[PDB]
Structures are given as C-alpha cells and as structure tokens.
Amino acid sequence: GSDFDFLKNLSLEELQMRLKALDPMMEREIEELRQRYTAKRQPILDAMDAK
Amino acid sequence: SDFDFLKNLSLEELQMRLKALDPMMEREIEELRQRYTAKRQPILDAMDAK
C-alpha cells in the first residue's frame, strides 16, 4: 500500500482498483487467522477426548 | 504444545488452555479489521480529493 500523498496522484480508476483489492486480501488474511486458531485448538480438543 | 504433551494434562487444565485462545483470537481479528479499515481511508480520501 501507499500513502495519501502518492495515492492522490493516481487516476480515479487506479484508485478504485486499489480500493477493491483490499477486500479479498482482507478475507484471505482473516481466513488464515481462523485456520491458525483451528489448528491450535485441535490437539487440545483431541486431548480432552482422549482422557 | 503438541498432543503428546497435552494428552497428559487434566481436563480442567485443557479447558483452561482452550478458553485462553479466545480473547487472543478476538484481539488479532480486531487488529486485522482495523488494519483493513485503515488502508481504505487514504484511498477514499484520494478519490474525494480529485
């Protein structure tokens, strides 16, 4: 990403492209985070069921 | 840690370990969302300045 000072000099169509790209990037990041925690929970969950 | 360690702990200890992950996850998700909202603003402002 860039700062406002650089962004303001981009075309409106380039800006809309940049704005739109944030959404799947964000969705990818949160998905990875959720999977990261699922993976953390799994061995604890199994350990509880193994008793 | 690994299942081979966790399997030897009490049910109460394991439940505590599960519950401990919750606010950590909550925090990191909120940080992720704030970072997205942040990234949007200078682009939105750049659009409105033109």
Residue numbers in the entry:
A (entry chain A): 1 to 51
B (entry chain B): 2 to 51
Please share text taken word for word from the publication where this structure appeared:
Recent research into cellular homeostasis has shown that the Hippo signalling pathway, which is mediated by mammalian sterile 20-like kinase (MST, the human orthologue of Hippo), controls organ size in animals and regulates cell proliferation and cell death. The MST-mediated apoptosis pathway is controlled by its interaction with RASSF family proteins and the WW45 protein. Interestingly, all three classes of tumour suppressors, MST, RASSF and WW45, interact through their SARAH (SAV/RASSF/HPO) domains. We also elucidated the MST2 homodimeric structure and performed structural and biophysical comparisons of the homodimeric and heterodimeric interactions.
Like the MST1 SARAH homodimer investigated in our previous study, the MST2 SARAH homodimer has an antiparallel helix dimer structure with a short N-terminal helix h1 folded toward h1′ of the dimeric binding partner. The main dimeric interactions consist of hydrophobic interactions of the nonpolar side chains and several inter-protomer hydrogen bonds. The distortions of the main helix h2 at the conserved proline residues in the MST2 homodimer in protomer A were 16 and 27° at Pro457 and Pro476, respectively, while those in protomer B were 12 and 15°. Thus, h2 of one protomer had a more linear structure than that of the other protomer. In addition to this difference, the hydrogen bonds between the h2 helices of the two protomers were not symmetric. When we overlaid the two protomers of the MST2 homodimer, we found that the side-chain conformations of Tyr470 and Arg474 in the two protomers differed significantly from each other, resulting in the positioning of the hydroxyphenyl group at the other side of the dimeric interface, while most of the backbone and side-chain structures converged well, with a root-mean-square deviation (r.m.s.d.) of 0.81 Å for backbone atoms and 1.22 Å for heavy atoms. The structural differences between the two protomers in the MST2 homodimer seem to arise from crystal-packing forces. In addition, the short N-terminal helices h1 and h1′ in the MST2 homodimer have been identified as typical α-helices, while those in the MST1 homodimer are 310-helices.
